[PDB]
Amino acid sequence: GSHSMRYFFTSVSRPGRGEPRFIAVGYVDDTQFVRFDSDAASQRMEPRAPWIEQEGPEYWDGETRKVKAHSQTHRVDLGTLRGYYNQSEAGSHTVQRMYGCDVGSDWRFLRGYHQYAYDGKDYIALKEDLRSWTAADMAAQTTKHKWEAAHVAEQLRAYLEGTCVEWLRRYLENGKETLQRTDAPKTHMTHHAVSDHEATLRCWALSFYPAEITLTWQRDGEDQTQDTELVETRPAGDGTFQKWAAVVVPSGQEQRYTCHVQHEGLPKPLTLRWE
């Protein structure tokens, strides 16, 4: 299957009480491997996954070097935007940056990213052509201008179609056991009566990886979409994910309903039926 490497950056200004808080994390598919926290003691890029601890001091000194630069960068970004919108320096604001690359099953470049968001609204993003930008307002447009002269896109392109892909692949290899693993979900069904004329049907999908999944309920073959309780795929905390979907059923019809599970780690799609 295809894979990706993403870097999430969050900076929050805390006026009147120190320097803005900066958090940085990075992923390979759904596994986090490194992190950096401005409020932490180390003031260093730290590992968050086993398969990266191997990397020597060069890697850690380099990433600690780059990560700090990012922090400073978004520390300034807060300033700039604060002016781009004539905002009170009293209020706290947020800046989010997320860049990375995707590769197909062939481990070849498939598309890259580089997007921003100020206080939750899309600010500026790199288009697919990796050669142009999407400015939202006049502010983002002014930034787009700067990045156009500075020829930022071209540079970012090299990173995305090159270095980025190459590290993903490396990490993919060095982490074969984890990153390249798959765990078909462990599916089971629970039945608890709500009343003397109804029952709840819960379909479970546990300990699976990656997070991509499709858990569906069907009555006599028809999707019960709009009548299904579907929680967000959540993390077990052990590296695997969980998920469930439930429907309220008229006591006596449990057999009409079927749960359908779809996961990249299942030879064929699952079909469970209470009985």
Binding site: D77, T80, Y84, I124, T143, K146, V152, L156, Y159, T163
Partner: peptide, 9 residues
């Protein structure tokens, strides 16, 4: 590994 260039808004 992080990108080595550090653009500004």
């Amino acid at each position: 590994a992080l990108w080595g260039v550090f653009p500004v808004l």
